[PDB]
Design a protein around this ligand. Structure first.
Ligand SMILES: *[C@@H]1O[C@H](CO)[C@@H](O[C@@H]2O[C@H](CO)[C@@H](O[C@@H]3O[C@H](CO)[C@@H](O)[C@H](O)[C@@H]3O)[C@H](O)[C@H]2NC(C)=O)[C@H](O)[C@H]1NC(C)=O
Ligand SMILES: *[C@@H]1O[C@H](CO)[C@@H](O[C@@H]2O[C@H](CO)[C@@H](O[C@@H]3O[C@H](CO)[C@@H](O)[C@H](O)[C@@H]3O)[C@H](O)[C@H]2NC(C)=O)[C@H](O)[C@H]1NC(C)=O
Ligand SMILES: *[C@@H]1O[C@H](CO)[C@@H](O[C@@H]2O[C@H](CO)[C@@H](O[C@@H]3O[C@H](CO)[C@@H](O)[C@H](O)[C@@H]3O)[C@H](O)[C@H]2NC(C)=O)[C@H](O)[C@H]1NC(C)=O
Lengths: 128, 149, 110, 149
């Protein structure tokens, strides 16, 4: 009976927290629009329609907060918690590109450094 | 290890701001025996009690704990309509802590026929202890044996 | 002390990247949450000692939870999820390989 | 949740009176000096139970289903009859004759009893149940990261 009555008298609306770190890059820009919020949820909105393409929820009690977010031409880098675990996401598709475990410090700043041609290293500076 | 507890009663027209010593309660934690010893009421107190009953007042009982103050209210109209029968119960924790007390009367009626001076001479009270009870857990051992057998 | 848990899940068919979308793994249920890789792998860090039930959550093809026991010395022991019994049923290797049977039945048939 | 054995235990408590009734015309807590019987039972639920609610109707002639949320997002409704304190251990004649199932501490999450077929809630903060007007219809709305009705 449930398969017959799919969406007759039911509805769901999906929502997102307050925009904290959003980027408006992607020179091609078909519909991609990344948003990372202050409720430990990272979503992707659409420029044309506005729906959610892919969204990820990790935490929200006291940990996993997003501190900084960098954007390459095709990939996104972000730091969660306070400088312990870092993971990189993709935007064409959605999932994890790579992960890295940091040391026991206080996250202060990050940046991109490029040797001669382009960026190959990300500098992360902690308290010490 | 025997400790005394102070039991006060209240008696007014409609408010309650006066408290007087009624008796001494002895409580021994290690055994678990609770004893009461209260003095008898005077004729004036009996008359005031009878007057309060016809005024459908309130009977507040104060029991200080070593501090905290625990009070319990009970209708005295049923107490006067029926025979004097109070039941006291102390509430304790898993350790030496006092939660509170409740006064309960077995008749618990509201007919209110009459009270005779012969009735209100002696105090009829019983003190009881109610320690916390341990709830049971899953009886899976019996279920496993039943499945096997 | 902190330890890390690795795992790899394989779908019968379709495509790993299609199933990766909206896919996560729970270790306790709201305490530790792991995310999947591009094809499939869950890697979880910052874990204390104890026994936990790893389960891959998906509105799509579901997975069987697996009990994992973690020792302080560094031994990893995986077993089937047993609640009535609390003994060792059968021992399987540490490289978690979950095999989703298929779509769970959500609607009844008339 | 139990620390000794890693599991979630489910305790259901019920209050029951005796065979004879009281006044049953006007209820009051000043009167009624009786202690009701308390029944406890234990079960096993393999989940976290983020949210919890009961379906409430206007008159109350239908069944009483318990709605429980899961970390997955699916909301499962289970009947109160299964989690009943009157569950005899050994199968006896009259109990099995009237309406009863032998007691067994194993509760499985059936996929058929899944209100959330496709639509899931990432974070289940709470659910609200509102009684409708016909007889047997309750509007359930789950709030949190998303909204679903
Ligand atoms: C002073 O207090 C004692 C104890 O609280 C009273 O003894 C109690 O007396 C009542 C009736 O007077 C007894 O009730 C009886 O209960 C049985 C069933 O248990 C029932 O079949 C009888 O018809 C009757 O209702 C009660 O058992 C008895 N003992 C207790 C409560 O432990 C005593 O009567 C009080 N004295 C005065 C002058 O009120
Ligand atoms: C069960 O509880 C009900 C409600 O409390 C009792 O009915 C009520 O009983 C009282 C006391 O008999 C009645 O009060 C009467 O008031 C008139 C003046 O209005 C007075 O002249 C009488 O002497 C008496 O005090 C009250 O009217 C009555 N209410 C109703 C709706 O009937 C009932 O008696 C209780 N039954 C038992 C067995 O406890
Ligand atoms: C859970 O949701 C997914 C969508 O995200 C469901 O897959 C889609 O289900 C709809 C129907 O619920 C399919 O639509 C159908 O389209 C055909 C024409 O292609 C039409 O003839 C049918 O009447 C119906 O409208 C849709 O094709 C399908 N998409 C895919 C890629 O499979 C999924 O079935 C849902 N899970 C359930 C219902 O268990």
């Amino acid at each position: 009976v449930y398969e017959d009555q799919v969406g007759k008298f039911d509805w769901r609306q999906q929502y997102v927290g307050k925009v904290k770190f959003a980027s408006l890059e992607f020179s091609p820009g078909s519909k991609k629009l990344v948003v990372a919020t202050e409720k430990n949820v990272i979503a992707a909105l659409n420029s044309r329609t506005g729906e959610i393409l892919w969204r990820h929820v990790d935490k929200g009690t006291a940990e996993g907060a997003v501190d900084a977010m960098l954007l390459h031409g095709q990939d996104v880098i972000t730091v969660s918690n306070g400088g312990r675990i870092m993971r990189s996401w993709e935007t064409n598709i959605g999932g994890l590109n790579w992960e890295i475990t940091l040391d026991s410090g206080s996250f202060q700043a990050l940046g991109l450094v490029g040797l001669q041609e382009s960026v190959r290293y990300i500098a992360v500076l902690k308290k010490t | 290890g025997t400790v005394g507890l102070l039991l006060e009663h209240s008696f007014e027209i409609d408010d309650s701001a006066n408290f007087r010593k009624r008796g001494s309660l002895l409580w021994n934690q290690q055994d678990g025996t609770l004893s009461l010893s209260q003095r008898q009421l005077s004729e004036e107190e009996r008359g005031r009690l009878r007057d309060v009953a016809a005024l459908n007042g309130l009977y507040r009982v104060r029991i200080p704990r070593r501090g905290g103050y625990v009070s319990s209210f009970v209708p005295a109209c049923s107490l006067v309509e029926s025979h004097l029968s109070d039941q006291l119960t102390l509430h304790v924790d898993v350790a030496g802590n006092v939660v509170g007390v409740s006064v309960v009367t077995h008749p618990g009626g509201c007919r209110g026929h009459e009270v005779e001076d012969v009735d209100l001479e002696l105090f009829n009270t019983s003190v009881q202890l109610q320690p916390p009870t341990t709830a049971p857990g899953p009886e899976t051992a019996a279920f496993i044996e039943r499945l096997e057998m | 002390d902190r330890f890390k848990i690795e795992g790899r899940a394989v779908v019968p068919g379709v495509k790993p990247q299609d199933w990766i979308s909206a896919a996560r793994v729970l270790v306790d249920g709201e305490e530790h949450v792991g995310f999947l890789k591009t094809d499939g792998s869950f890697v979880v860090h910052d874990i204390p000692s104890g026994s936990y039930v790893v389960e891959v959550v998906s509105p799509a093809y579901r997975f069987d939870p697996v009990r994992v026991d973690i020792t302080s010395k560094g031994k990893m022991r995986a077993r089937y999820v047993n609640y009535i019994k609390t003994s060792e049923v059968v021992r399987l290797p540490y490289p978690l390989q979950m095999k989703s049977s298929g779509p769970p039945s959500y609607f009844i048939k008339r | 949740w139990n620390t000794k054995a890693r599991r979630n235990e489910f305790t259901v408590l019920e209050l029951y009176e005796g065979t004879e009734q009281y006044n049953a015309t006007a209820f009051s807590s000043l009167d009624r000096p009786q202690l009701p019987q308390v029944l406890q039972q234990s079960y096993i639920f393999p989940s976290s139970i983020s949210a919890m609610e009961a379906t409430i109707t206007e008159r109350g002639i239908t069944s009483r289903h318990l709605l429980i949320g899961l970390p997955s997002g699916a909301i499962l409704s289970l009947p109160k009859a299964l989690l009943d304190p009157r569950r005899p251990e050994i199968p006896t004649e009259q109990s099995r004759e009237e309406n009863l199932i032998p007691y067994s501490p194993d509760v499985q999450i059936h996929a058929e009893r899944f209100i959330n077929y496709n639509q899931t809630v990432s974070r289940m903060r709470g659910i609200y149940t509102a009684p409708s007007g016909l007889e047997s219809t309750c509007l359930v709305v789950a709030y949190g990261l998303d909204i679903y009705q």
